[PDB]
Coordinates of C-alpha atoms and ligand atoms in Angstrom, one line a residue:
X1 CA -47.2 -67.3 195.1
X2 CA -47.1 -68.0 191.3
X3 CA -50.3 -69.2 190.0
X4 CA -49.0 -70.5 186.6
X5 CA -46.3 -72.3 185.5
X6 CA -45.6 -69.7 182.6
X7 CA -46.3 -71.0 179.2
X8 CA -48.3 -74.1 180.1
X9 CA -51.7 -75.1 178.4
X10 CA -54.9 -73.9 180.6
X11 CA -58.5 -75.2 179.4
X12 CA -61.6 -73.1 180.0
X13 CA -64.8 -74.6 181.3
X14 CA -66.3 -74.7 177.5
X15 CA -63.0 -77.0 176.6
X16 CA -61.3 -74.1 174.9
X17 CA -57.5 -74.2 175.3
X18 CA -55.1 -71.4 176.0
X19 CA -51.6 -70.7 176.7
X20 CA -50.3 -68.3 179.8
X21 CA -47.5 -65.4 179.4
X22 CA -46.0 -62.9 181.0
X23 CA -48.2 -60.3 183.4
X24 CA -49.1 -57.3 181.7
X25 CA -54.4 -57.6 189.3
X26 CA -52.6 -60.9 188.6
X27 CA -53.1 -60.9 184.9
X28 CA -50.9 -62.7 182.1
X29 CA -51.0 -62.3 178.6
X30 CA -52.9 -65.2 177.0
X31 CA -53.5 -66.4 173.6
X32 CA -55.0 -69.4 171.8
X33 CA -53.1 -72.7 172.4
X34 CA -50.6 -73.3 169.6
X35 CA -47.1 -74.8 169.1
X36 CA -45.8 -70.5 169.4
X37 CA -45.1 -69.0 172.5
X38 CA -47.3 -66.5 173.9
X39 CA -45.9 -63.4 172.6
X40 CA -46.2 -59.6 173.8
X41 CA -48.9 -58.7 170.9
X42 CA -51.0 -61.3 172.7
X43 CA -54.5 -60.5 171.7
X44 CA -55.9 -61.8 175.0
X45 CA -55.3 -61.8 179.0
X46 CA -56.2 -64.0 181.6
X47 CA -56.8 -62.7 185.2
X48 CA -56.7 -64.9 187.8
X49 CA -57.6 -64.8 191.4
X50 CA -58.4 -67.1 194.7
X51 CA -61.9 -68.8 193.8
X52 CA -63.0 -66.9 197.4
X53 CA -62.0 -63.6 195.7
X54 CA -65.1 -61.6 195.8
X55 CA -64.5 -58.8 193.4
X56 CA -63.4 -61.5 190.2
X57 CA -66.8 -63.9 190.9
X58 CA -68.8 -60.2 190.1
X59 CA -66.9 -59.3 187.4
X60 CA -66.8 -63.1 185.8
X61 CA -70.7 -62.9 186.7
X62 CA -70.7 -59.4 184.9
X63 CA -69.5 -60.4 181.6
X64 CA -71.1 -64.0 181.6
X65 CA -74.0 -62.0 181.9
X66 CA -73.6 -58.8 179.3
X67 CA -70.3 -59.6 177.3
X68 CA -71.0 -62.8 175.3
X69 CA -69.1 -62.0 172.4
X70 CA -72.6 -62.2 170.0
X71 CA -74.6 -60.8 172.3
X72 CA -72.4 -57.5 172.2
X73 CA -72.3 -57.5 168.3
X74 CA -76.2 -58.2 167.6
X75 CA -76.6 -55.0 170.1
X76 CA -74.2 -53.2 167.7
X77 CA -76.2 -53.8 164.7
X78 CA -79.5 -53.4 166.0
X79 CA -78.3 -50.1 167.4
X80 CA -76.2 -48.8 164.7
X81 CA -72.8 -48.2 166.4
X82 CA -69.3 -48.5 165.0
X83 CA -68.2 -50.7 168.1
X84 CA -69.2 -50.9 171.8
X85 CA -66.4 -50.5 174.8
X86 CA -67.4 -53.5 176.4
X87 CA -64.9 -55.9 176.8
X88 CA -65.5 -59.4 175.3
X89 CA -65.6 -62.5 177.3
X90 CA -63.8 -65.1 176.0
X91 CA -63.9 -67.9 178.9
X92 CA -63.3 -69.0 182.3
X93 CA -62.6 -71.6 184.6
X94 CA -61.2 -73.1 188.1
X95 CA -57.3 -73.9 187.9
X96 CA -56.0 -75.4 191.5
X97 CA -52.1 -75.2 192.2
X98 CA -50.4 -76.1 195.2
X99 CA -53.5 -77.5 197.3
X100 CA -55.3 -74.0 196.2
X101 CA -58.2 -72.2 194.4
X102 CA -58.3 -70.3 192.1
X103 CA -60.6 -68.3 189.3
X104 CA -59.4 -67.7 185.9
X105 CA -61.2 -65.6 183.2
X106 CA -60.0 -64.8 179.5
X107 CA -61.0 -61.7 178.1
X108 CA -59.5 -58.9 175.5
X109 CA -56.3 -57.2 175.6
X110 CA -56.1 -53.5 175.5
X111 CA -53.7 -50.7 174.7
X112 CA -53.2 -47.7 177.2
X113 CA -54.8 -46.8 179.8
X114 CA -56.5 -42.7 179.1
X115 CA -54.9 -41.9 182.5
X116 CA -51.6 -42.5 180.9
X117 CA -52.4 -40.2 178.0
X118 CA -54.0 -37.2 179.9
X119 CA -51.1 -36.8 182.3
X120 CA -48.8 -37.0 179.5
X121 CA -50.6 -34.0 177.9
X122 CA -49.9 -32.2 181.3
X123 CA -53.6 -33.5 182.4
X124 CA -55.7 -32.0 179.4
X125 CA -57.7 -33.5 177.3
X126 CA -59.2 -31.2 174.4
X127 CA -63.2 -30.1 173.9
X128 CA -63.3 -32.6 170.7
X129 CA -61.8 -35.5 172.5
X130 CA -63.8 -35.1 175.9
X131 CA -67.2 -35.1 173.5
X132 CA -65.9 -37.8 171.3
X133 CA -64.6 -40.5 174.9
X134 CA -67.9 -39.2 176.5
X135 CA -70.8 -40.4 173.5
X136 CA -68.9 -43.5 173.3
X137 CA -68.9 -43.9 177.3
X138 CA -72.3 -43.0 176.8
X139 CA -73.4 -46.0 174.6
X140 CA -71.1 -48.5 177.3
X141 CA -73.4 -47.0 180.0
X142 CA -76.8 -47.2 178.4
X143 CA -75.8 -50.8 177.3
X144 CA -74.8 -51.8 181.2
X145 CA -77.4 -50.4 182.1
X146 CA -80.1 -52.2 180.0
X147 CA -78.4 -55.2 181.3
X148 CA -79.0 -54.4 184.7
X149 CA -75.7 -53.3 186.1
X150 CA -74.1 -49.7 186.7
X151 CA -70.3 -49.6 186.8
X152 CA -70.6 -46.8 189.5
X153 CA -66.0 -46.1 189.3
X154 CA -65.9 -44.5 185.6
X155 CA -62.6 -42.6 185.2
X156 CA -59.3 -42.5 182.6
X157 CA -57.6 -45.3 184.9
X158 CA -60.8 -47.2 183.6
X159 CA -60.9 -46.8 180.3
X160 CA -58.7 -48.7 177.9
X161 CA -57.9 -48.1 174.5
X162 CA -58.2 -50.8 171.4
X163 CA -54.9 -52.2 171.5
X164 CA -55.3 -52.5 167.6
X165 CA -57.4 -49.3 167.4
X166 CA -57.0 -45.6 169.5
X167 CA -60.2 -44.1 168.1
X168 CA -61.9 -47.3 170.5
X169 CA -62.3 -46.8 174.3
X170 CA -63.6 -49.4 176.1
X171 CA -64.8 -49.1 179.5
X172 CA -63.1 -52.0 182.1
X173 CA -62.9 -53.5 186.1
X174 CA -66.6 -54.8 186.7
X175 CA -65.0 -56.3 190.4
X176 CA -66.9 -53.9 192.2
X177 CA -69.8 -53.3 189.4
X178 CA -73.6 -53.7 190.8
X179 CA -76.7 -55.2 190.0
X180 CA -79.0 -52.1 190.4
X181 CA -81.9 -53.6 188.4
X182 CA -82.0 -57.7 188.9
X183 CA -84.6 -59.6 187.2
X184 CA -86.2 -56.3 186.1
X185 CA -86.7 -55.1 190.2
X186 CA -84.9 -52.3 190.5
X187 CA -82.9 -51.8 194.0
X188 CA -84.4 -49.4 196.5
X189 CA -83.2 -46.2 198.0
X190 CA -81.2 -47.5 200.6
X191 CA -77.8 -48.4 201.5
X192 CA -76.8 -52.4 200.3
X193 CA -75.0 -54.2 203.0
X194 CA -73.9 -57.1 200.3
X195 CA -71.5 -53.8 199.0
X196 CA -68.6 -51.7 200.7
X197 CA -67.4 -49.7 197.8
X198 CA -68.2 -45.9 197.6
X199 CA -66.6 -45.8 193.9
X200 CA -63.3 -43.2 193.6
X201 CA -64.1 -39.9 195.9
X202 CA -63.4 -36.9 193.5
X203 CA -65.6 -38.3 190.8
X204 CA -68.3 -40.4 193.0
X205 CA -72.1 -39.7 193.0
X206 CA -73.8 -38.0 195.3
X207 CA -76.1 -41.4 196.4
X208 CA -72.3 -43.3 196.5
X209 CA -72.1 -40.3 198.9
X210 CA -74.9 -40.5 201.1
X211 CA -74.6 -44.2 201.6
X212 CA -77.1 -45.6 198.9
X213 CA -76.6 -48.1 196.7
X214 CA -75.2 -46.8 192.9
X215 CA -78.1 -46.3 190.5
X216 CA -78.1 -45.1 186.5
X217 CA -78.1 -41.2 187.3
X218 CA -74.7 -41.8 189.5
X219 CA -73.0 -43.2 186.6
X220 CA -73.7 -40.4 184.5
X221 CA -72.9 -38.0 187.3
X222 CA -69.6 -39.6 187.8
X223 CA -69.2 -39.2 183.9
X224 CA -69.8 -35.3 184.5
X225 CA -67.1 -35.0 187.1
X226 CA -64.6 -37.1 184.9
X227 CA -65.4 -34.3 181.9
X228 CA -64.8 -31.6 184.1
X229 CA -61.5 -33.2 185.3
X230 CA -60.4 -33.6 181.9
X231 CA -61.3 -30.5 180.5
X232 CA -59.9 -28.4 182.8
X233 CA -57.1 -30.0 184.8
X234 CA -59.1 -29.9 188.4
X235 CA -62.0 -30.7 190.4
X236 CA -62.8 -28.0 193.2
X237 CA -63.1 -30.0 195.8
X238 CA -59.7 -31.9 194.7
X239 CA -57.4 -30.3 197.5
X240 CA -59.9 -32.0 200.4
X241 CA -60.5 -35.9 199.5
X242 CA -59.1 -37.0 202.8
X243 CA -62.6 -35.2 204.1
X244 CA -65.9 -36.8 202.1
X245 CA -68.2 -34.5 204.2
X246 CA -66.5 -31.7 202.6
X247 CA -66.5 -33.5 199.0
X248 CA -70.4 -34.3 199.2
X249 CA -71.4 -30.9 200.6
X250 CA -69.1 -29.2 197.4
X251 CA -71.3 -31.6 195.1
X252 CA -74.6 -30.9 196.4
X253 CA -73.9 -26.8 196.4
X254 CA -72.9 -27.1 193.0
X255 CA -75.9 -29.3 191.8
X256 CA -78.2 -27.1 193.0
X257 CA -76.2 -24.3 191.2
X258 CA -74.4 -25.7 187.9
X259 CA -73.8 -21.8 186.9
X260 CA -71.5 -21.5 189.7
X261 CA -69.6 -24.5 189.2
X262 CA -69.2 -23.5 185.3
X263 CA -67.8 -20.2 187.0
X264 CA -65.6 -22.1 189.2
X265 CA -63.9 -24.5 186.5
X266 CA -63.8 -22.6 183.6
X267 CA -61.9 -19.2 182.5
X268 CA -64.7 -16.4 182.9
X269 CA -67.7 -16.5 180.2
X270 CA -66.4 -19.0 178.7
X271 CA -67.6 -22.2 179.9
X272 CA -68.7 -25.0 177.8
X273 CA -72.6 -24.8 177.5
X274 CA -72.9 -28.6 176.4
X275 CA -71.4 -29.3 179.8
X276 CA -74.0 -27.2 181.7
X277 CA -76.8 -28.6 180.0
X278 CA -75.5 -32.5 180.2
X279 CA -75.3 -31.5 184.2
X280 CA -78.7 -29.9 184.2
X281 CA -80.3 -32.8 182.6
X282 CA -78.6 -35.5 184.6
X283 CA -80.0 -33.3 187.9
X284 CA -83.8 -33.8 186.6
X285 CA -83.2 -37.6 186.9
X286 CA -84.9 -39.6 190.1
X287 CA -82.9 -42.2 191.8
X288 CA -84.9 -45.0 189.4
X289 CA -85.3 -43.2 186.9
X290 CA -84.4 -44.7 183.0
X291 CA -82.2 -41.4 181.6
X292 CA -83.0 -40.6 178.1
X293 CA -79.3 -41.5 177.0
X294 CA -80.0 -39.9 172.9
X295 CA -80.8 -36.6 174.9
X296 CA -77.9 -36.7 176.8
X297 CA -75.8 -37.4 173.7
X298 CA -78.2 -34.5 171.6
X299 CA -76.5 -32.2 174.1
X300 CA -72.8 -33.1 173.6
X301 CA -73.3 -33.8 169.5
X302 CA -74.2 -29.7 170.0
X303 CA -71.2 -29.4 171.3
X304 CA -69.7 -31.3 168.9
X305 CA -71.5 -28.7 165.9
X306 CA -70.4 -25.5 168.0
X307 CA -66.8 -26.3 167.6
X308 CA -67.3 -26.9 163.9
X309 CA -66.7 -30.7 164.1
X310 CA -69.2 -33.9 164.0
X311 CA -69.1 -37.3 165.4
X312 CA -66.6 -39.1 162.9
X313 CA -65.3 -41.4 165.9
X314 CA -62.0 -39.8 166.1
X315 CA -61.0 -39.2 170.0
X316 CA -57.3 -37.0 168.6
X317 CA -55.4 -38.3 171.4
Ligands
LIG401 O1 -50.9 -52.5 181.2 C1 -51.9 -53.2 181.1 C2 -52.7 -53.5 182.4 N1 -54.1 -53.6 182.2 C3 -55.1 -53.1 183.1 C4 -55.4 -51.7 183.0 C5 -56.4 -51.2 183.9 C6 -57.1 -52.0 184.7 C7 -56.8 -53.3 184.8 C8 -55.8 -53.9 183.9 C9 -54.5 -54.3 181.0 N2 -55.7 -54.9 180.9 C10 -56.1 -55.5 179.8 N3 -57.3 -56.2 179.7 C11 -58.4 -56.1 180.6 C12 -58.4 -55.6 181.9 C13 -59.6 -55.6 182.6 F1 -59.6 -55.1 183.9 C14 -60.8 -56.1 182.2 O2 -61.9 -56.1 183.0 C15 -60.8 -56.7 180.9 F2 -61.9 -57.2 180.4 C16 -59.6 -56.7 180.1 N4 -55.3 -55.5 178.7 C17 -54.1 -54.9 178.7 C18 -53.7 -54.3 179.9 N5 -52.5 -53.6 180.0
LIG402 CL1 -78.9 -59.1 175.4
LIG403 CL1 -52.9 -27.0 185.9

């Protein structure tokens, strides 16, 4: 059932007007209203969804939230960064067609997925760009995460490049994000029954795998699987995700022994020790525990220095 008739005028809930494309989820390129079509270098989308569509109310919440556009800049010059991967909320509203509901929300448009890219270079990624994706993913989580929500499903499929930009990742799909800390009250250790999703199985955490709700230490657990992934190719556990007994017991062995799993993934003594350590640390961490996110990225700007390069922001994709 179309949702738009295509090229008609839409008007947020702050008055804003916009004009609906072609899809590019139900999502349409969008761009301010004007007298010009909406054209395929659209700088916007819209995404659109029943009003009783769960997952778009608590990603719309999400960015209401943490993505006001000035909200995410003051954060980048009070912290110093070149750009944050959050995705900018632009508007929303309700549009009704046909005797029903539904949600629309404006946001930015993006290039390429990183899945895309990694499986076009036969599912590598080099040492330089896996530091360089994972400090920036790093400053996305510790910013989420200050603002009381972990993403708890980080992966390539998730991560969007800058369509104007592909030094810029930016990490997106809050549908099934989670309010681990609201008001300040963090969530206890415990399953939530408001939430179903167990993130993506070959790169969940642990807690995601024994039922509990997704915390800050998960994120940057599922961050570690995702730079083993794309170092190497594989996972070890990747030939049994019909069986999550069998992927949980492989990631607690391997927890409680990071040597072996550098053994396992990597070409004899010659693991990458950045990676070890980044594991090690993200072990120490208690289910409510605040991670020391410059430690974290300490360890991988090492990494950065033992390969004779520095954080210049280039991700040489
Ligand atoms: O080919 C595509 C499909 N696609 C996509 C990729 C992965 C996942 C979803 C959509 C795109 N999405 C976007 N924007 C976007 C998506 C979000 F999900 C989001 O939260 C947000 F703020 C912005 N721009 C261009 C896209 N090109
Ligand atoms: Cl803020
Ligand atoms: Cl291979």
């Amino acid at each position: 059932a179309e949702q738009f008739a295509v090229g008609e005028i839409i008007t947020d809930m702050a008055a804003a007007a916009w004009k609906v494309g072609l899809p590019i989820g139900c999502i349409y390129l969008a761009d301010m209203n004007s007298s010009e079509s909406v054209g395929s270098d659209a700088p916007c989308v819209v995404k659109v969804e029943p009003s009783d569509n769960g997952p778009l109310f608590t990603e719309l919440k999400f960015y209401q939230r943490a993505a006001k556009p000035e909200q995410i800049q003051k954060w980048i010059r009070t912290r110093k960064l070149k750009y944050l991967g959050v995705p900018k909320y632009w508007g929303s509203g309700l549009h009704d067609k046909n005797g029903k509901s539904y949600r629309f929300m404006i946001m930015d448009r993006f290039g390429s997925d990183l899945q895309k890219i990694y499986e076009a270079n036969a599912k590598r990624f080099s040492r330089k760009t896996v530091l360089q994706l994972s400090l920036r993913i790093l400053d996305i989580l510790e910013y989420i995460h200050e603002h009381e929500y972990v993403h708890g499903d980080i992966k390539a499929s998730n991560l969007l490049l800058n369509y104007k930009n592909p030094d810029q990742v930016y990490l997106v799909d809050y549908g099934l994000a989670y309010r681990y800390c609201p008001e300040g009250v963090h969530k206890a250790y415990a399953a939530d029954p408001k939430r179903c999703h167990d993130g993506t199985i070959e790169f969940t955490s642990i807690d995601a795998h024994n039922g509990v709700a997704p915390s800050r230490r998960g994120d940057l657990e599922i961050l570690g699987y995702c730079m083993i992934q794309w170092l190497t190719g594989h996972l070890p556990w990747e030939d049994n995700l019909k069986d999550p007994k069998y992927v949980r017991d492989s990631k607690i062995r391997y927890r409680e022994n990071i040597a072996s799993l550098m053994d396992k993934c990597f070409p004899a003594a010659n693991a990458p020790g950045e990676i070890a350590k980044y594991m090690e640390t993200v072990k120490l961490l208690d289910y409510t525990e605040k991670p020391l996110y410059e430690n974290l990225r300490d360890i991988l700007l090492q990494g950065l220095k033992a390969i004779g390069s520095k954080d210049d922001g280039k991700l040489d994709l």
